[PDB]
Amino acid sequence: SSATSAFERMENKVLDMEATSQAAGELAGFGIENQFAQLEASSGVEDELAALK
Amino acid sequence: ALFDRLGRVVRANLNDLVSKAEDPEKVLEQAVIDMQEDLVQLRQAVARTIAEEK
Amino acid sequence: RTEQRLNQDTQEAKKWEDRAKLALTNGEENLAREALARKKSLTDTAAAYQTQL
Amino acid sequence: AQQRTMSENLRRNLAALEAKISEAKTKKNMLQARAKAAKANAELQQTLGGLGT
């Protein structure tokens, strides 16, 4: 009675394994910020080009 | 090494035997005939590629 | 093959650069930022190509 | 709030796999040629030497 009462506790510890996996992946390769800096640097030049024409 | 040697021997004996059956006058004539048929097919192969150029 | 792959990426990346000019004109930052993100995605692949060549 | 945390974990690991497949495809281009080269070279080394027949 109530599969949830036991099963969720198991899921709550499967979650830890995923969290460990996630942290390892993010730590190994960060690319969002590196890509992001390129975007905003690109923009400043576009303003200068726009102003001239 | 061992099987490799024996398999060469089988090929080698056959190679000698077929060369004996190659007469030089007839085999030469036949080869020229084959080449002429091949040339026509090749000309048509180029023609069908030139077709898509057009 | 390597040469051929590199050729594609550099020029599709340029079409994104053109799209970014339009996006700023229209006034849609989201498309402009996406265009820059897509441009970078191909810039990174193009770089990898020469190495591979 | 829970869904948003779960979705991010899934969204991130999708990007990692797509990148991983790209890494494999980029190598596969050159690896295939390496394998073909090695065998022909090995066959040739026997020919140059006396080893085998």
Side-chain angles (χ1 to χ4, degrees):
Chain A
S1 302
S2 187
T4 38
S5 294
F7 176 42
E8 289 175 353
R9 310 290 73 82
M10 315 179 189
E11 295 187 74
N12 295 148
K13 300 297 170 292
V14 169
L15 184 144
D16 299 351
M17 310 178 189
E18 299 180 75
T20 300
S21 298
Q22 182 198 123
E26 291 275 58
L27 181 58
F30 296 103
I32 309 302
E33 70 299 299
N34 296 343
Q35 294 286 67
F36 185 86
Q38 305 322 296
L39 318 180
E40 301 190 306
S42 189
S43 302
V45 183
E46 294 177 293
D47 299 344
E48 294 178 297
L49 291 167
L52 291 163
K53 301 297 173 59
Chain B
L2 179 61
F3 313 112
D4 301 348
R5 291 173 67 209
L6 185 56
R8 183 170 297 192
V9 170
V10 172
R11 291 179 296 188
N13 282 238
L14 295 166
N15 188 13
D16 194 12
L17 290 163
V18 67
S19 188
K20 299 172 196 301
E22 286 180 354
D23 185 347
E25 295 186 64
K26 287 59 165 182
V27 175
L28 177 65
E29 178 58 64
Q30 184 56 67
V32 174
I33 295 166
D34 295 317
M35 288 161 63
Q36 291 176 104
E37 298 180 301
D38 297 346
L39 177 60
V40 173
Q41 187 287 123
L42 291 162
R43 173 165 290 101
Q44 292 310 116
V46 176
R48 290 172 291 191
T49 306
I50 293 177
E52 288 285 357
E53 180 185 61
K54 300 301 184 296
Chain C
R1 293 305 242 99
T2 34
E3 294 165 6
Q4 184 55 57
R5 294 176 190 109
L6 169 59
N7 185 314
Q8 295 310 108
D9 297 348
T10 51
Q11 298 312 112
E12 267 291 298
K14 287 283 174 295
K15 294 305 306 182
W16 293 110
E17 292 194 295
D18 299 346
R19 282 183 286 263
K21 304 300 180 294
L22 306 177
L24 296 173
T25 58
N26 300 338
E28 284 178 356
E29 301 310 295
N30 190 18
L31 183 58
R33 300 309 287 271
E34 287 179 66
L36 295 168
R38 287 290 295 104
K39 172 266 298 185
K40 292 266 61 267
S41 298
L42 293 164
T43 293
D44 298 346
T45 55
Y49 277 133
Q50 163 57 268
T51 55
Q52 290 306 111
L53 175 56
Chain D
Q2 305 317 301
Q3 306 320 311
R4 287 176 299 199
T5 57
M6 295 155 39
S7 294
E8 277 295 301
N9 169 91
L10 265 165
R11 282 180 289 210
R12 189 61 69 258
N13 210 9
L14 178 60
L17 184 54
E18 291 173 359
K20 173 65 176 182
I21 295 166
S22 299
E23 167 182 297
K25 182 169 184 178
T26 49
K27 287 173 289 184
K28 173 173 177 184
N29 302 334
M30 92 184 174
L31 294 168
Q32 289 177 118
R34 280 278 68 165
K36 294 307 304 182
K39 297 182 297 182
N41 295 355
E43 289 171 0
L44 184 146
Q45 296 327 111
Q46 302 307 102
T47 192
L48 293 181
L51 304 176
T53 317

